[PDB]
Amino acid sequence: NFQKVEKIGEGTYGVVYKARNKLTGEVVALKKIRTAIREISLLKELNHPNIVKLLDVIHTKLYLVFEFLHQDLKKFMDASALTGIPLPLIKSYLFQLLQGLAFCHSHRVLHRDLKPQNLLINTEGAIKLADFGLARAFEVVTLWYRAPEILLGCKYYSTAVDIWSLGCIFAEMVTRRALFPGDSEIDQLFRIFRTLGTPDEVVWPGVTSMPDYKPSFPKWARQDFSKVVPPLDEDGRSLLSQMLHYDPNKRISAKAALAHPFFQDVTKPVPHLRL
Ligand SMILES: CCc1cnn2c(NCc3ccc[n+](O)c3)cc(N3CCCC[C@H]3CCO)nc12
Ligand SMILES: O=C(O)c1cc([N+](=O)[O-])ccc1NCCc1c[nH]c2ccccc12
């Protein structure tokens, strides 16, 4: 084979290896997965600083060669759990991720499975989206970041599902605890309901006609964001509240989120990375 190879983890659609090109010496990441071959390959020339670069596509069964990043945000959050990630770095990372989402959404590409392990960081302060759910689009599953319209059975969900996931990640960076740590689809939905209130037609028109909506759902009252992400200042809570709107049509877009006052003082700090 063309590479020398070491496992780094499991994406949603296949296993990921750190590897060195035998002839070139390039250090890269290889994802092994298992027409569509087409639109994936366009993504080689659609590049953004906050999206992981796809280097090559190879089919026998399907290999994807990516640039290599040195840490993922789950490991970085775990490493930072005793002290917390500094607010300026949280804010820089959120801003960068919204830039990546604005870009891919503007090209009508959804991610669909944002989670801390899929967000990759380097020593220079960048963070990049990875592990796009693009294989269906063209070992226990984590539901903690799933938008409620997905859980309620919406077939044709939108770019808003990514804003929801990013909102959950934002909250988790701030509080150092997962916002909605469910272990089943209904447990995930009811954890969301218990925190944000059971949605109704007032806050989410059409929710009661969603495929998996049940009139027998318990009706929980909404608690206040002061309780949900206490340390976060009012600008951060306002932005988070707009990222976690039940109605996908009221939920803030990535482009709109970038203009939120929370980012008026955004900067690009350097993380303390132990590699
Ligand atoms: C795009 C392919 C890729 C490139 N770098 N990289 C990294 N680098 C960080 C890193 C390096 C060395 C050891 N560790 O533990 C982390 C991790 C990672 N992933 C996290 C773990 C689950 C699989 C996979 C998901 C997201 O692609 N995927 C990638
Ligand atoms: O990230 C993955 O694992 C992944 C998986 C599959 N797949 O499984 O078919 C396909 C593509 C993937 N990444 C592409 C990253 C990418 C480069 N330029 C872009 C421009 C817009 C949106 C995204 C990108």
Numbering used by the authors: 3 to 36, 47 to 72, 75 to 152, 162 to 298
Task: Reproduce passages from the article.
CDK2 is a member of the CDK family of kinases that control the cell cycle and is activated by binding E-type cyclins at the G1-S transition, then by A-type cyclins in S phase. In addition, CDK2 must be phosphorylated on the activation loop to become fully activated. CDK2 also plays a critical role in meiosis since Cdk2−/− mice are sterile but otherwise healthy, making CDK2 a validated target for non-hormonal contraceptive development. In this paper, we describe the development and mechanism of action of type III inhibitors that bind CDK2 with nanomolar affinity.
To substantiate this notion, we determined cocrystal structures of CDK2 liganded with 1 and dinaciclib or 1 and roscovitine, demonstrating the ability of CDK2 to form ternary complexes with type III (compound 1) and type I inhibitors. For type I inhibitors such as dinaciclib and roscovitine, the DFG motif is not engaged in critical binding interactions, and the DFG backbone is free to adopt a conformation compatible with the concomitant binding of 1. In addition, the observed compatibility of our allosteric inhibitors with type I inhibitors (but not ATP) demonstrates the potential for higher efficacy if type I and our type III CDK2 inhibitors were administered in combination. In contrast, the potency of ATP-site inhibitor dinaciclib is largely independent of cyclin concentration.
